[PDB]
């Protein structure tokens, strides 16, 4: 129920850094990011309208590590909610526990963050939570349990988080290894290379 194949392959098909590697090195030093995977990779794929919508949807899914059935449920929930459907969908994806623990920095990648959550290293509000998709609420506190507070992977992940734009909507402390989810992020705080209208249009066909 999880993609286990090569990671940089997806980044090359999207033609964009999907943050599937930690960031110790450059993606251009780790792969040929400019070339699509496979035998016919150098060719320039002329993409139709359905193609551009599909590629946008696949980019978001591969960033967050969400398969299609669960992602479709997210769209249904986002459409049901009040406001804007695309911004609501991005809000749900950002509220996933894997994304939150990654954003505060207890994980090099979202795969590393997901393994920590799965292996019961994380506590929200004082309770061990094993479920990756768990939707964290505003004012919640996410912590690394004492048993796992020794892991060198956590330490090095915190260092790498210091080298990225620090999210404005969460409050982290690397001494106690506890973060606070203050509010739900807005479209101003998320990367604007996403094009949510394509996803909304795709699911409205």
């Amino acid at each position: 129920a999880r993609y286990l194949g090569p990671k940089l392959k997806l980044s090359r098909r999207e033609g964009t850094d999907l943050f599937l590697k930690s960031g110790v090195r450059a993606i251009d030093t780790k792969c040929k990011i400019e070339q699509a995977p496979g035998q016919h990779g150098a060719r320039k794929p002329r993409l139709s309208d359905y193609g551009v919508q599909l590629r946008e949807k696949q980019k978001v899914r591969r960033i967050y590590g969400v398969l299609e059935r669960q992602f479709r449920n997210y769209y249904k929930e986002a459409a049901r909610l009040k406001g804007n459907t695309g911004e609501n969908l991005l809000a749900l994806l950002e509220g996933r526990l894997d994304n939150v623990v990654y954003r505060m920095g207890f994980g090099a990648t979202r795969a590393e963050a997901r393994q920590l959550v799965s292996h019961k290293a994380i506590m929200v509000n004082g309770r061990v939570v094993n479920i990756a998709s768990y939707q964290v609420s505003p004012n919640d506190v996410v912590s690394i349990r004492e048993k796992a507070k020794k892991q060198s992977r956590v330490k090095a992940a915190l260092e790498l988080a210091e080298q990225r734009e620090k999210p404005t909507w969460l409050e982290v402390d690397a001494g106690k290894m506890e973060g606070t989810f203050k509010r739900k992020p807005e479209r101003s705080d998320l990367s604007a290379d996403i094009n949510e209208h394509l996803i909304v249009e795709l699911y409205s066909k």
């Binding site: 309208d49 406001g83 804007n84 459907t85 695309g86 911004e87 209208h197 909304v200 249009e201």
Partner: protein, 156 residues
């Protein structure tokens, strides 16, 4: 700053005495994403020449649409030959839910939210004409009030 889009390229034939003369037609739409949109139809013996003629023709003969915050003013109906085209203002976030040709023209004219539905022949040439005619026959509260001799608040 004018976004351009080629909607359809189509090969036609003339059947001269010696045989068939194949030529190409290109349908394109240009717009400034802020209420101005035009369409151009160009023919030539090669695809690049055809699209070029169409783009130039489309940059000229553009018109102005009274857009309301990326949406329509009110539900409009457009009709050209055998193509009918219904369009409706929608709420922010819906996207542009329109058909095949209507998608290109609305995107380039700056409409970000609309509910559209084509009734009748979906020939791209006639569809583009009908949707542009509908967008052109759409009035805003300011001009409606000026026409009726009232204030906008009087018309609400």
């Amino acid at each position: 700053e004018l976004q351009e889009k080629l909607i359809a390229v189509n090969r036609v034939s003339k059947t001269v005495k010696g045989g068939r003369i194949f030529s190409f037609t290109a349908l394109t739409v240009v717009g400034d994403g802020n209420g101005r949109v035009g369409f151009g139809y160009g023919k030539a013996r090669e695809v690049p020449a055809a699209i070029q003629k169409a783009m130039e023709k489309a940059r000229r003969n553009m018109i102005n649409v009274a857009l309301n915050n990326g949406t329509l003013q009110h539900p409009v109906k457009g009709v050209h030959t055998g193509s009918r085209v219904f369009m409706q203002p929608a709420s922010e976030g819906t996207g542009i839910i329109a058909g095949g040709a209507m998608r290109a023209v609305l995107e380039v004219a700056g409409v970000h939210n609309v509910l559209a539905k084509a009734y009748g022949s979906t020939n791209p040439i006639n569809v583009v004409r009908a949707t542009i005619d509908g967008l052109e026959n759409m009035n805003s509260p300011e001009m409606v009030a000026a026409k009726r001799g009232k204030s906008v608040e009087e018309i609400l």
